[PDB]
Design a protein around this nucleic acid. Sequence first.
RNA 1: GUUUAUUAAAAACACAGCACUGUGCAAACACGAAAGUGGACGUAUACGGUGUGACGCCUGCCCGGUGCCGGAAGGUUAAU
Lengths: 77, 99, 149, 271
Amino acid sequence: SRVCQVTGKRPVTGNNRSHALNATKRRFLPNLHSHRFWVESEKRFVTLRVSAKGMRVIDKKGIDTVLAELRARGEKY
Amino acid sequence: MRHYEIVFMVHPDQSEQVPGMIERYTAAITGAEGKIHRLEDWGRRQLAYPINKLHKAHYVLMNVEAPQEVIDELETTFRFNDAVIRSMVMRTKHAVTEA
Amino acid sequence: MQVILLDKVANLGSLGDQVNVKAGYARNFLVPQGKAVPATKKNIEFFEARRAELEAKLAEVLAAANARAEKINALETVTIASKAGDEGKLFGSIGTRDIADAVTAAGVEVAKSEVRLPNGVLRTTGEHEVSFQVHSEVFAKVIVNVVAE
Amino acid sequence: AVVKCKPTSPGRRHVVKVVNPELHKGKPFAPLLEKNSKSGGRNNNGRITTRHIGGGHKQAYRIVDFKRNKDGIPAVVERLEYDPNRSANIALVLYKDGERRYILAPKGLKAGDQIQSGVDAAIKPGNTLPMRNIPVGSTVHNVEMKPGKGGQLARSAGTYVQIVARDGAYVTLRLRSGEMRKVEADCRATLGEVGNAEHMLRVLGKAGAARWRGVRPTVRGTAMNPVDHPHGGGEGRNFGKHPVTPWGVQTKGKKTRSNKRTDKFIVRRRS
RNA sequence: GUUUAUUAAAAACACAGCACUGUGCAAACACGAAAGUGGACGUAUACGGUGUGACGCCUGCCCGGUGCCGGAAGGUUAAU
């Protein structure tokens, strides 16, 4: 669905409050983006569906670490 | 069997590509019936107005006695061969000799 | 996110300098093409002695081997003899795959991605120059004169 | 050609119909056929998306080759079929190697005419070329928008694209709408104008002709109720309102070109 | 021809035709929190919307108001 595959950002719900504080139910959607990554360990290009915060996690720790944690969650990469 | 002065012009640079064309222009006419009667290359010389932004076009004169229909097909080449730039085929009385 | 570097560099680097740059330039072009490493607090341990003194001069003598790859063809010319049109305006436009076959026939075995045609796709029959990306700095001087059949 | 029907009865009173002798009186070529079910305007959720569509005759789809992927081999035109799917009559062309294929018949085309495709052939009407061998000032049809896509523009009966200009890799077309456009030069295009040019001169006479055409009745806004259409209600034909579609967006003037990633090709918008 | 099944069959609705307007094709519009479908295996002589309703003679003046379309030099003008 609309799930960050690295970080797990489920689309949450919320109240939309206008200037007169009239509540209307709305949905918060993450900044999901499909990305093609390069791993020199597999030496190829993988396809993930991540968010920008997830992209910064890919920047900070190694992609070989995030891939093994994704395999620890038993997910698909 | 009519006699036409075919006067056409080519680019300045493509005077390397003029002559063999006349030879297949020879094959335009004497292949069917056509007698070529003059060949006077006036060559590259200077223009009173730059058609397609260039002076000095290549004038080629060629006189022929020929059937009309190969001359119709010759104009279907003169339209679409993109080297020849200005080309008129006038009808005359006889096939002539001198410059 | 800074860098630790592998080649010399096109612009921002000199084989062993760390420059903080935009991370899109890290992810799209620096990392997967094989020219940079994000240095990640332990690749500085990789690059202090184990790479900057042994992989650097190996990279530079491989650069001399790319210069040798330019020296593979002794002639630095080609004359492709594809079929062409009647007095100019060639039959089909000759290709980078076809010029790849015509240079690996006798001479350089360069990659087709390392073939550059600076004068378009050579839509006239005449004198043109093609160059080969043997390196980021030095190039080949191949002269092409296609002939109509 | 265009003939008027003698007014014995009202449905025959107003009909002006286009008779044509060149069309092949016979069943069409069978392996180029396949079945073609009518939709009624109903998508996979079953609801009407486009109204005023349904009914009419049952008709079979003639597979028509727009790609012209065969090159360098001559072909000759066997006969001319009438296609129900489109406004132009189609032609069953027969190649020399043994293939029979449906093409869009241009204006100047009779049976026995000769046609060759490729980058080579000629500038005769019927020949497929890239838009690098077709001269400026020409008149083409069945124009590709992407190299190898098949042929998009100028496909109705009697339409034609005048090739205006060429800046390097790009060919400026003057489309039939009046829009100017840049297209890739390597795309294919067939010369001439499409045939059946008298297709605009039929007037259908009666309600049943548009009914068996495949078109349902069309109900006005001022008739309906204020729930069904925003031009609803009134005590005997009041309008009072700016004209809108049934879904709120104001018709009769409002521009809604909303593409924004293909404006690089448009030289001039339609005027 | 169709319409208030079960008090209203008509001058109402539709209709062929006419005009305006949108639509360059990953078309507009529609059903779809999306994929995808219908449009359409059609491509501006085509498609969607709006009005009037065959055919004959025709459709005048007003752009102040609201709407629409084009311009943006200038005032006003949000988040950051």
